[PDB]
Amino acid sequence: RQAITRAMADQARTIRIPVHMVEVINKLARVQRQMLQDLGREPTPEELAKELDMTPEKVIEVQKYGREPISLHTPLGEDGDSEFGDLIE
Amino acid sequence: IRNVGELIQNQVRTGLARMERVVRERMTTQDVEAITPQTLINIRPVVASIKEFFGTSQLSQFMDQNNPLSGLT
Amino acid sequence: TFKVGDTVVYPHHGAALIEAIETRQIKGVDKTYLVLKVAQGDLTVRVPADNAEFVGVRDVVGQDGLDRVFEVLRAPYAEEPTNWSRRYKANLEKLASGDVIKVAEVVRDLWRRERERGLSAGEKRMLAKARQILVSELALAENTNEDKAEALLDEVLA
Amino acid sequence: LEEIFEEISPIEDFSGSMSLTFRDHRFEPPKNSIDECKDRDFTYAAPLFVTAEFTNNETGEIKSQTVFMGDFP
Predict the structure, then answer these.
(1) Distance (Å, rounded) from C-alpha A30 to C-alpha A58?
(2) Contacts (Cβ under 8 Å, ≥6 apart) of A65
(3) CB-CB under 8 Å, C27 with D57
(4) SS3 of A14, please?
């Protein structure tokens, strides 16, 4: 379990996230899921911050860091030649 | 014709199948006399499937509101 | 042994009150089914009387319960292994044991180690769960309930 | 929805001991009006509640509970 989760922290994401950041962010994700299944509603970030004893700006920062990039070559729709990569300047 | 009801039922069924997969994984790694119905089930795949159907699916289309005939068509 | 209108404590859910007695039959076999519910999880628990001792229900302990819990709550010379993994594996097992005394030293050790070092916030979830279930248990055991039950601990935990 | 919930049979482990069953489903009034959803980029949805019981034959234990299944559009 240790080596598997270390490799998942180190190599899965395209942008490398250190293992302690990974364990912090997925602990926050799992306690957010616990909050969602407990009260049936989306909690404010202040509540999650105060129930985990970190600052709310830290929570905003870490859920901004915990994001997955979207591939450049996503098709737009019915048209096939028009790709997402030619829309960016 | 698969109407809106049968399509939404199929998407909810796929989400429920994923939820049953997750919970079947959960019971085999969980002990008896400590399992609560609030605990072992997870509704994340269900809402994920519903939001995946309603957003960015070829059947759920952006409504054309040129004029009432466009809406009815 | 079991009546109607009384209170019995269920594991992993705290104390609860018995509503009535039903005659539900499971697997085609008639059983003396007893039904009770709790206000925390908003769930109803149906347990037959024949396997009530086997499933692990206990009655409310009277005066004997508070004196022994207070005495253990203040027992000194408590030691734990240096590695946190063994204690982590032992605490949930002692919680699932269901003994009031056992959960008493578990929560006392957890509170003292949380105050002396400030371990983490992940364990705080089960710490709060254990505190809630013990204060729900001593609600009928010590004859003090709700805020009064919480208040009594506020001056005896040190 | 009652068909999609009755289709999910009470499932068993490999020992055939404990099971969960979704008996009845119900809906609550939506927390937002239609114009409120159309204004602040909300989804017109209502919470979905189901009655779920957790039955184990060995202990004879039934845990009937109501669980939030998701915001249903």
Answers:
(1) 17
(2) A17, A21, A25
(3) yes
(4) coil
Q: Report which of D54, D49, D55 is spatially closest to residue D70, judged by C-alpha positions.
A: D49
Q: Is C58 exposed, middle or buried (0-12, 13-18, 19+ CB in 10 A)?
A: middle
Distance, in Å, from the CA atom of C104 to the CA atom of C70, rounded to the nearest integer, reads 9
Q: Name which of C11, C80, C64, C62 is nearest C41 in CA terms.
A: C11
Question: Which residue's structure tokens are 């949930």?
Answer: C92
Listed in sequence order, the residues at least 6 apart from B52 whose beta carbon sits closer than 8 Å to its beta carbon are B11
Over the range A7-44, which residues count as b (16 or more CB within 10 Å of their CB) and which as e? Answer: eebeeeeeeeeeeeebebbeebeebbeebbbeeeeeee
What is the C-alpha to C-alpha distance for residues A89 and A86, in angstroms, rounded to an integer?
Answer: 8
**Helix (H) and strand (E) counts for chain A?**
4, 0
Contacts of D18 in chain B (CB under 8 A): 27, 32, 35
CA–CA dist A28, A36 (Å, integer): 12
C-alpha span between B7 and C51 (Å, rounded)? 46
**Taking CB atoms and an 8 Å cutoff, what residues of chain A touch C121?**
51-53
Name the E strands within chain D: 18-27, 46-56, 61-72
Measured distance CA(C138)–CA(C149) in Å, rounded: 7
D17 contacts chain C (CB < 8 A) = no
Nearest 5°: the CA angle B41, B46, B51 is 150
Residues C7 and C15: beta-carbon distance below 8 Å: yes
Q: How many CB atoms lie within 10 A of CB A59?
A: 19
- DSSP annotation of D55 reads E
Which tokens hold the place of B28?
């085999």
Question: Are C136 and C40 within 8 A, CB to CB?
Answer: yes
